[PDB]
C-alpha cells in the first residue's frame, strides 16, 4: 500500500532517499549521499506494486537515479530492484546495478553490482 | 552432451579457455586473455553436473580464476556460472562476478558483473 512506502529512509552507508508513492503505482522523490546538503540531491523516478499479495509477502518495487544535477555530472545511472517488507521496523531490501558511459573497448567492465538495506525514519 | 565440454573454447573478445572434464564432475584447465602471449595464462578449477537431465536441458557448470601467476597479481578473482549446450553448434552461456581485494571504505564498489558466450570457433 502506498502510504507505508512514503517517507524518509536511510541505508547502512548513510545516504538519504525521500519518496512519495502515488495511487497509480508511481514513485518520485530525491536521493542524497551522507555529506548531506543540497548537492548531492538528485531526481529519482520509479514504480511499485500498488495491489500487493496479502500473506506476509513483500511489495516489489524499483527506481532509477541518473547522476547529473545542476552542480555535477558523473555520467552514470544506478537502478535499485527489491521489496518493501512493512511491520514495526519497516525495511526496503535491494540489490543495485551502477552503469557508467564507456567507449566500446571498455564496455566489459562498465557495471558494478551490490546491495542496500533501507530503514525508515519519517513519512 | 557431457564430455563435449572437454576442448578449447573462445569468448567474444578473444580470450581462450582450455578444459578437461573428469567423469565425476571436476573441471580443470587454463584461461588466457587475447594478445596470446604465453603468460596471460592462469589456472582454473570448477565443477559441473556429471549426470544431467534427459529432457533437452543444458548442463549446469561453473569455475574460478584468481588473477595471479608468476608474472602478475591483479588482487582479484572471477567466477563464471552458466550452462553448456551441445549440438552441431555447441556453446557455453555464462554470467560472471569479478571481485577485487579492497579496503573497507571502498568495499561497496568492489564487484563488477558481465556475460560471456564461449564457442569452439
Amino acid at each position: 500500500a502506498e502510504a507505508g512506502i512514503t517517507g524518509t529512509w536511510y541505508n547502512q552507508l548513510g545516504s538519504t532517499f525521500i519518496v512519495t508513492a502515488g495511487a497509480d503505482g508511481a514513485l518520485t522523490g530525491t536521493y542524497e549521499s551522507a555529506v548531506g546538503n543540497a548537492e548531492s540531491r538528485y531526481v529519482l523516478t520509479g514504480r511499485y506494486d500498488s495491489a500487493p499479495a496479502t500473506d506476509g509477502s513483500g511489495t516489489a518495487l524499483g527506481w532509477t537515479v541518473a547522476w547529473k544535477n545542476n552542480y555535477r555530472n558523473a555520467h552514470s545511472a544506478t537502478t535499485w530492484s527489491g521489496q518493501y517488507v512493512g511491520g514495526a521496523e519497516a525495511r526496503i531490501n535491494t540489490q543495485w546495478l551502477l552503469t557508467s558511459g564507456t567507449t566500446e573497448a571498455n564496455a566489459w567492465k562498465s557495471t558494478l553490482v551490490g546491495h542496500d538495506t533501507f530503514t525508515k525514519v519519517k513519512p | 552432451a557431457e564430455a563435449g565440454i572437454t576442448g578449447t573454447w573462445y569468448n567474444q573478445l578473444g580470450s581462450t579457455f582450455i578444459v578437461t572434464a573428469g567423469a565425476d564432475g571436476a573441471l580443470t584447465g587454463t584461461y588466457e586473455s587475447a594478445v596470446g602471449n604465453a603468460e596471460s595464462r592462469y589456472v582454473l578449477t570448477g565443477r559441473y553436473d556429471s549426470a544431467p537431465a534427459t529432457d533437452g536441458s543444458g548442463t549446469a557448470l561453473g569455475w574460478t580464476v584468481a588473477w595471479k601467476n608468476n608474472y602478475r597479481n591483479a588482487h582479484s578473482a572471477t567466477t563464471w556460472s552458466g550452462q553448456y549446450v551441445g549440438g552441431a553448434e555447441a556453446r557455453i552461456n555464462t554470467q560472471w562476478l569479478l571481485t577485487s581485494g579492497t579496503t573497507e571504505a571502498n568495499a561497496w564498489k568492489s564487484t563488477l558483473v558481465g556475460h560471456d558466450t564461449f564457442t569452439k570457433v
Partner: peptide, 7 residues
Amino acid sequence: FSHPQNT
C-alpha cells in the same frame, strides 16, 4: 581500472 580478464 584495467585487468587481465579481457584483451
